[PDB]
Amino acid sequence: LDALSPEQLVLTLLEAEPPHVLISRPASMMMSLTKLADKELVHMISWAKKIPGFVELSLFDQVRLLESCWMEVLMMGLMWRSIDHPGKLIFAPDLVLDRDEGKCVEGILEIFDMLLATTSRFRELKLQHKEYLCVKAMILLNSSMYPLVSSRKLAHLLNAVTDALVWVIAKSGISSQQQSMRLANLLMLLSHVRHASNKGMEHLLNMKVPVYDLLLEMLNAH
Amino acid sequence: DALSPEQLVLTLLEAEPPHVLISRPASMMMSLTKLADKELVHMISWAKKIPGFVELSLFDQVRLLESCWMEVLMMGLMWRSIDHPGKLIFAPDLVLDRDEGKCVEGILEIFDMLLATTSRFRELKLQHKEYLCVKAMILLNSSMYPLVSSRKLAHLLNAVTDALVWVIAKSGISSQQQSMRLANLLMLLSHVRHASNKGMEHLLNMKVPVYDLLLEMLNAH
Ligand SMILES: Oc1ccc([C@@H]2Oc3ccc(O)cc3[C@@H]3CCC[C@@H]32)cc1
């Protein structure tokens, strides 16, 4: 019970953060992004396994969640590290792209504008490092509906992270009407992250590295 | 004042779209498509009746309407299907159960999302008042751009939120639960959005033109 307490939880998530990912480059832009995603996915699994109780869900839900959230969690990560630099998307330490470079590949420009706009909204709200940690945990725990309709366990966990986020906003010292508004504002943003995630998945499947199959392999590895 | 919690809910209540009968003299998709086109007209009316919507720049109005329509149709579908597991009450003469979804490829998947999301709103015991606020929110939160008149949209979105928060408050539940229920309701918005995208992808992969017809309506005003 206690390891899921608001304070402990935020610190545990903090330590569970993924490492920086160097793509190490010796079609191409899309080759880069794809190789990057594959690499991040490995660390994403590690991350999820470090979230208190995740490992104690049924392997069936762990797999459902991961398979449904990966693109969203990757994009949440992109937005967060691009949060202080308008017009750019810091994908990895050796891969910073600005809006315009998105014109090369067709279809990508639209997605970039979504990501940049959502990032802009997170910068305007002044997203906090610990609010960000809870949100990202929520994106995962809330990626799939089915595993909720072990379900007892997922719901408890999803409530834990939420209490944590509510706790985080509370010590913000702001009023009670604002606390509610900020909670609502942060959550509504999730719809946009999901959205961008869908446009990304769609675009990725309309393509002719196999990230999705590679993810399924990683899912079998465990 | 017209945006004050109690008043706003009653106003949204009166703005509800009428029942829509398709009146049937490929086909399933033909029906669903004829239905959408019809509901879209009433959806515009609905949105205009939301306090202050008509006051946003026509550019924002069009922007919001163009991206939320599918979500609002599905929020409507879920709400009227909420008491009937395994089925989707699309219209008074169009009730489809899950399996009828195997006929058209790609649709069974989407039906299962809608049935699951509806299933969850039933578990949360979504109230008629909450449903009214949530749907307004789906519209007001459909596009990020018009927000990043912006002043106006933000104020509007906050108004509906206060309303929802107000609604949950008179629920008499504790403050920890109030926060949880608010958070539980909002997260469902990601799934509605999700289903909305799957529905759009599918509709565009098809070979009635709802989207163009929508764009026309967007001009008739
Ligand atoms: O950290 C990351 C790493 C990678 C990505 C995705 O990469 C893709 C690859 C191939 C595609 O057809 C689409 C995409 C998504 C559209 C833009 C970025 C997004 C997000 C975040």
Ligand SMILES: Oc1ccc([C@@H]2Oc3ccc(O)cc3[C@@H]3CCC[C@@H]32)cc1
């Ligand atoms: O009230 C309504 C009326 C209509 C709809 C959409 O209709 C479609 C039509 C054509 C398509 O290729 C997909 C769809 C969506 C997939 C299931 C229903 C949804 C939702 C809600």
